[PDB]
Amino acid sequence: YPRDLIGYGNNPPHPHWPGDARIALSFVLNYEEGGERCVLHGDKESEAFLSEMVAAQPLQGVRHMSMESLYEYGSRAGVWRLLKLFKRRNVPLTVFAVAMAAQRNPEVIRAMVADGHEICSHGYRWIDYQYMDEAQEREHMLEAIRILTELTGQRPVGWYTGRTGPNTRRLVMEEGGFLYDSDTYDDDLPYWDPASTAEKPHLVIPYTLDTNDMRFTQVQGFNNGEQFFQYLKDAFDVLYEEGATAPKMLSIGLHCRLIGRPARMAALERFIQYAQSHDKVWFARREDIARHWHREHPFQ
Amino acid sequence: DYPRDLIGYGNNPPHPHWPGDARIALSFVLNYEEGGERCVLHGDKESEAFLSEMVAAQPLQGVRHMSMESLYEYGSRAGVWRLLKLFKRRNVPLTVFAVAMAAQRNPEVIRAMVADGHEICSHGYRWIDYQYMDEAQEREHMLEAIRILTELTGQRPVGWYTGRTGPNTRRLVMEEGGFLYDSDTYDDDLPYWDPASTAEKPHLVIPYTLDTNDMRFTQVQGFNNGEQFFQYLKDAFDVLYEEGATAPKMLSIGLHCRLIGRPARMAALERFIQYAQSHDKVWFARREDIARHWHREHPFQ
Amino acid sequence: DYPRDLIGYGNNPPHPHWPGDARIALSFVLNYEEGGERCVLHGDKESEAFLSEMVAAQPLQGVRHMSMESLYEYGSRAGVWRLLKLFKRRNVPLTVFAVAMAAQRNPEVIRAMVADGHEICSHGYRWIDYQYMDEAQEREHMLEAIRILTELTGQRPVGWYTGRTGPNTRRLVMEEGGFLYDSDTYDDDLPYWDPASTAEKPHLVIPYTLDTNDMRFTQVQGFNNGEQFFQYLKDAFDVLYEEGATAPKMLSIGLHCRLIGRPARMAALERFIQYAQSHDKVWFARREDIARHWHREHPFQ
Amino acid sequence: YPRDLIGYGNNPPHPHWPGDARIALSFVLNYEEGGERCVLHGDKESEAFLSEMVAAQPLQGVRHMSMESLYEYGSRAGVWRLLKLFKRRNVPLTVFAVAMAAQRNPEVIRAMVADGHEICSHGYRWIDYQYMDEAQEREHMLEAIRILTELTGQRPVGWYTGRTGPNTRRLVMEEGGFLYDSDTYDDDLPYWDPASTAEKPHLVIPYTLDTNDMRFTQVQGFNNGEQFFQYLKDAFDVLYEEGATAPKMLSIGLHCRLIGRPARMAALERFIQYAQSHDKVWFARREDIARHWHREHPFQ
Question: What is the dihedral of CA D288, D293, D294, D295, to 10 degrees?
Fold first, then answer.
């Protein structure tokens, strides 16, 4: 049976975070705009996911103008608002950068690098990989690595597809250059993938679909900032209390086209401020968590 | 040859220098669609399904859907007047996104809107989806909307908003040549000149909104109540007003007669207006006034 | 030719001169549908899918859906009694929208409703969609609903509300001739005389609601808790009560036994009633009482 | 007409709860992770129900990796967080344990038994039984009983399928070894099933789909914990007031993968604390409610 339902069980390791933090926070900014479904991108259909058009369907072989425009908000305006927020609050980001999206807006990528944020690969295209053949999925991976290396000067050491298929994580681990991937939702702590060997260990840093602004546009989620703030506050409070004895981590997922809207950004800043008002909080990039785990908890 | 502008102003948006050196411009928009929606009586092949209390409704083929008609009639009979009274009471101007067929069917409300000084912007001839409409028919609808709105108001509309555009809609608007602006985008916090603009024919885009919009009261996972809507608008205002200490932007607030015209929802709208009015340096504008301002302050070059 | 009235009272609604010169009339409506819904046991082709905790439910063809049956049984076994106790405790009259088959299956609750002085209004023979039903069969259902409700209560119903009407429903109600009012519209804040009224046969319309209605607790957009519902009702009340300083209106509040009969939801309802009761000049009315009042104060011309 | 629309009518019995409680609370922890739809479990499709992927559909004949991962959260992390909560607050649980899920994580089953929680059968598989053949459903029931007996040392005395078919409850009563089942949503009190006899009475303890964390992932659902807390508080307040003269019960349904997330757990703890701040509250296992009803209100 190939699934690990057990994990650490009732005995998770103490992460011993920097500063003996009671909680580690990983803010993640997705950058997908310009890489989504679009006939202009070589796709058979328009995009339908994660936009204000909460009931949208993909349209075959045509452009959906409103949908394109909603995505353009993220790359034109939302991204800059959010970069300014993270700079103002002095909180690092891991950016889940879709390589095609990056290619179409190199100046924002440069700004992200300038501000010291990690550029993590979010795949070549922002599409569903469920049914993609292995050779083609591998080709996309290599191309994503190539593009991100050229744009930033350094290869990505993290990987996150999101809409994975049965081969995705295997291919990541086979490529061999990734310190971690985040294509799981299965824990409150990093862990070494069962496929790890002494020679090739691979760290998993689980991500999130719940403390994630994508829920502002899904059939169940949040309709305002107050609700999102309360949700994040609760997660923080529970984990921070656990961290009196057993610290964990919390990921916070963000999208430029979504929380980049001023109506939603207020709650994000309020949460950052709330977190910052507590001592023993570690605000980390995913790569930093990965390098910490290699040092503190090496694979055995 | 990639036709989408993902970059826009980048990290260097212009200072709009709003009237009164406002830190934020607010554009309240009242849609008037009731009487122009899908209905077999309007020549459509199906009943309306969108933007009503029947949040799970589907279009019914070739038949009248009585409850759906009735819900729309609320907007034209009662909701619209409640809202006009509110904006008069608070002394806040509207841009009305007027569907021409809807306007034809209730000329008295159009006259009242004009009397109160609100802009009448074209919201197309029919309140239907134009995604798949042939260019010839879309052009004829445009001309008819212009004709009707001119007759009813005495002046041609200078703005355009379809909503459910097709790949030709914005091109046709710019081709017609008589529109100062259109609002068929959701791509920025400021107006900008469309890439298709020329020295002889500049065309201004004033981005609209699907988020600070009462349509969300009837969409899946939408606002449960007015408090939530008020908080949503307040947050947008607060963030932008703070930005406006150095770099003012604008905010659109989208409204529908059959939706926020209900007393349960109108309370939050009035609360938001009062909240905004309690701040100095807020410019409450019609879209055409924003357009005129942009021509003067930031002419196309 | 256009058969819809988009205009209504326009900007000149009549002053209703409510009893006690009330600033607002409140109509609390309790639906009683449980035992009349879709079920193969009831002669239907499929199980029920609407208005239950299973928000994503679809009808199942030709079989029983046990969980769905059970959720409906909660309303007839437990929810209804909780609600009747609440309205007795607060001394607020109801109009009950009673489905005739549901009533047949629980005559004791009907008797209790009559004992407490609530109006029994017809909600049709079956709780099903009438959109596609042939006229003859719809008329048969109507006559049967009248017959059953007359037998159970001792008096024929004088009100009618199907909900899921078809294009013939309201015409048939008016043709029957024994109804003082119907509530199969969502088009106004006041009663009005149907355009089909004559001096000989006036017919009053008392518009109902899909927004201030607990059905929204189980729809894809609505409420997830009582606090939200309370605030929604409070806002509706506040806006209308303020309008009523000069132009009083009415508000309907729709309730279902299986929904707001759950203790988690009933708290908000009681809180709203108390809030309403804390204000002077509030008329808590049965729909029949509103209808009787309109006949006296605003007779058809 | 086979349905009982009438029940107790306006004359429900006084339950005379232990301690003359004004309300009985039944907290129920579902344990389903590892028994859901999965090709690895022999199913034809992947799971789609009750996860953060609030718009998911079953995928035919393939694995849906994100969906598997979200379920693994419940068995790896959420379950332990919740067991710690109930131990900390000293509140007993009835666990609706799916037999296959239990098989795959015997350590958590042992921890549940150690903590004194009831292990109730939640069926052999966590699948829809609407369209299951009668003989096959009977087979599953027998297997669920066998597995649960083996793991805990004692046969389950309670039964809850959830997604029943027209034969499920009949089969439970036919088996004859269940003190109660909870496959109804029809009352605020236990009652004897109409099929009961003097020789074989069968108690029904109605469950809930409203005071249930499944709503955090259903189309209309709670945005956040505060809303769930208020929902539960209102239920408690109304029933506690009724209980001045006519006490009833309230079920609170929980899932490891859902309320086991720290963002949602805060509200649950807040509610337990709120309840505990009132006198005359009986926190009960469903089996305890069943044994009480046999003593206080025997079938006649």
Answer: 90
| Partners of residue C262 in chain D, C-beta under 8 Å | 210, 235
Q: Is D22 in a helix, a strand, or coil?
A: coil
Residue with tokens 């009503």: B52
Instruction: Name the experiment that determined this structure.
Output: X-ray
Structure tokens at A118: 């990690």
| Residue at B246: amino acid letter | T
DSSP conformational letter for A75? I
Residue B148: its H or E element: helix B135-153
For residue D28, give both structure tokens. 């129920």
Please name the residues between 189 and 218 in chain A that touch chain B, using a CB distance below 8 Å: 218
Measured distance CA(C292)–CA(A21) in Å, rounded: 71
Q: At how many degrees (to 10) do helices D168-175 and D134-152 cross?
A: 50
Q: Do B73 and C8 touch (CB under 8 A)?
A: yes
Contact D105 A3 (CB under 8 A): no
Q: Write out the residue range of the structural domain in which residue B134 sits.
A: 1-301
C233 in contact with B at a CB cutoff of 8 Å? yes
**Separation of alpha carbons D180 and D158, rounded Å:** 5
Structure tokens at C277: 């009761």
Give me the phi and psi of B259, to 5 degrees please: -105, -75
The C-alpha angle A192, A197, A202, rounded to 5 degrees, equals 35
User: Is D6 in a helix, a strand, or coil?
Assistant: coil
Query: How many domains is chain B built from?
Result: 1
Mutate one of B71, B90, B262 to test the C interface: name it (highest C CB count within 10 A): B262
φ and ψ at C251, to 5 degrees?
-135, 130
Give the tokens for residue A46.
């328009």
Q: Which residues are within 8 A (CB) of D255 and not within 5 positions of it... i.e. 6 or more apart? A: D29, D30, D32, D50, D74, D78, D213, D214
Residues of A in contact with B10 (CB under 8 A): 76, 80, 107-108
Start-end of H helices in A125-207 = 134-152, 168-175
- Which CATH number characterizes residue B78's domain? 3.20.20.370
Beta strands in D198-294 (DSSP E): 203-204, 248-255, 281-283
> Alpha-carbon distance B185 to C265, whole Å?
41
Residue A222, Ramachandran bin (φ over 0: left; ψ between -120 and 50: alpha; else beta): beta
CA distance A278 to A237: 10
SS3 state of residue C31: strand
Cβ separation of C41 and D2 shorter than 8 Å? yes
The subunits that touch chain D, with at least 3 C-beta pairs less than 8 Å apart, are A, C
Q: Is the Cβ of B266 closer than 8 Å to some Cβ of chain C? A: yes
D79-88 vs D262-276: helix axis angle to the nearest 10? 20
In degrees, rounded to 5, the angle at the alpha carbon of residue B143 between the alpha carbons of residues B138 and B149 is: 120
* B232: amino acid identity, one letter: Y
Amino acid at residue number D196: S
In the chain, the amino acid numbered B187 is D
> Strand C159-160 vs strand C181-182: parallel, antiparallel, or unpaired?
parallel
- How far lies D211's CA from each of B75, D55, D86, in Å? 36, 22, 18
Which residues from chain B sit within 8 angstroms of residue A270, using beta carbons?
none
Listed resolution, Å: 1.7
Whether B221 and chain C come into contact, CB under 8 Å, resolves to yes
Task: Please say whether the beta carbons of B78 and C192 come within 8 A.
Answer: no
Tokens of B243: 């930005």
Tell me whether strands D203-204 and D191-192 are parallel, antiparallel or unpaired. Answer: antiparallel
Give the Cα separation of B30 and A262 in Å (integer): 21
Determine the Cα–Cα distance for residues D77 and D257; give it in Å rounded to an integer. 8
Q: Measured between CB atoms, does B116 come within 8 Å of chain C?
A: no
**What is the enclosing helix (H) or strand (E) of A249?**
strand A248-255
Q: Is A30 exposed, middle or buried (0-12, 13-18, 19+ CB in 10 A)?
A: buried
